[PDB]
Amino acid sequence: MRKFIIVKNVKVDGINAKSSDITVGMPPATTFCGLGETMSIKTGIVVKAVSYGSVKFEVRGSRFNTSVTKFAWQDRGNGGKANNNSPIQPKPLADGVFTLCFEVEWEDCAEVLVDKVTNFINTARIAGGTIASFNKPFVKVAKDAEELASVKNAMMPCYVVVDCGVEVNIFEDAVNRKLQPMVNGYKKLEKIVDNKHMRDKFTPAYLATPTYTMIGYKMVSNVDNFDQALWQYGENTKVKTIGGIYND
């Protein structure tokens, strides 16, 4: 809770709205945690936590039956019948504008970080989308908990995701509690033996399924503790927030 960097009003087009087989819409916090990890490994700067807020979002299409994207022949098994309307294999798309906050541990200077971040953002992606435009990053300094409200308020205006936990399961909680599920981690099922077609022959491979937790959307000025709005990697392949379950 020392150094934060803010990038607000980032326009991304063509975001992959399909996060799982039952969740279509906002990417989960895992996507932003992976983006932060990619920034850390590529840039060489340790990043602690990531916070994301939704300024605008819209899934392409209508209220129901979102959309279908046309496919093309790109495999080496055809050539005779590859002339008319390849099959679908549906994949939804959406368009959104977000705002990001990154917890950074860097004290060498004050202006080099802005340049190094701007260099990475110009060639980065958000859930497969392309970044159209963004504002100039700026750095905020927090020494204690009381001034954390200022760096929190620096993110206006946007809607931040907070964690409320699961009671029984997402299906019953969504109808009763009126919240929306989200993916917070993966559970391993069984180890991959054949390492031929994998993208890496050194990293161990696993079959995993998403684990669901229920979240809520809150205005930035209405957040009690800012530590509840920051996400980071946890134990047993999970993503958790610093402040735990959000309580009013």
Binding interface with DNA (CB under 7 A): 76-82, 153, 156-157, 159, 178, 217-222
- Looking up tokens 């260099």 gives 119
Specify which residues 133 forms β-bridges with.
11
Of DNA, other proteins, none, which one does residue 121 interact with (CB within 5 to 8 Å by kind)? none
Nearer to DNA, 132 or 219 (CB): 219
Question: Taking the complex as a whole, how short is the minimal distance between the CB of residue 86 and other proteins, in angstroms?
Answer: 8
User: Between the CA atoms of 64, 186, 152 and 11, what dihedral angle is there, to the nearest 10 degrees?
Assistant: -50
Of DNA, other proteins, none, which one does residue 43 interact with (CB within 5 to 8 Å by kind)? none
Q: Which residues contact 224 (CB under 8 A, 6 or more apart)?
A: 246, 247, 248
Question: Taking the complex as a whole, how short is the minimal distance between the CB of residue 143 and other proteins, in angstroms?
Answer: 29
Nearer to other proteins, 62 or 248 (CB): 62
Of other proteins, DNA, none, which one does residue 153 interact with (CB within 5 to 8 Å by kind)? DNA
Backbone angles phi, psi at 72, to 5 degrees: -140, 160
Question: Taking the complex as a whole, how short is the minimal distance between the CB of residue 108 and DNA, in angstroms?
Answer: 28
- Residue 49: helix, strand or coil by DSSP? strand
Nearer to other proteins, 107 or 203 (CB): 203
Q: Which residues contact 46 (CB under 8 A, 6 or more apart)?
A: 40, 104, 105, 106
Question: Taking the complex as a whole, how short is the minimal distance between the CB of residue 224 and other proteins, in angstroms?
Answer: 18
Residue 222 class from Cβ within 10 Å (0-12 exposed, 13-18 middle, 19+ buried)? exposed
Q: Which residues contact 58 (CB under 8 A, 6 or more apart)?
A: 94, 95, 96
Nearer to DNA, 39 or 223 (CB): 223
Of other proteins, DNA, none, which one does residue 83 interact with (CB within 5 to 8 Å by kind)? other proteins
Nearer to DNA, 178 or 201 (CB): 178
Nearer to other proteins, 51 or 142 (CB): 51
Of DNA, other proteins, none, which one does residue 56 interact with (CB within 5 to 8 Å by kind)? other proteins
Q: Would you give the distance in Å from CA 82 to the centre of its chain?
A: 37
Tokens read off for 75: 């495999």
Question: Taking the complex as a whole, how short is the minimal distance between the CB of residue 4 and other proteins, in angstroms?
Answer: 21
Question: Taking the complex as a whole, how short is the minimal distance between the CB of residue 246 and other proteins, in angstroms?
Answer: 16
Backbone angles phi, psi at 121, to 5 degrees: -65, -35
Of DNA, other proteins, none, which one does residue 222 interact with (CB within 5 to 8 Å by kind)? DNA
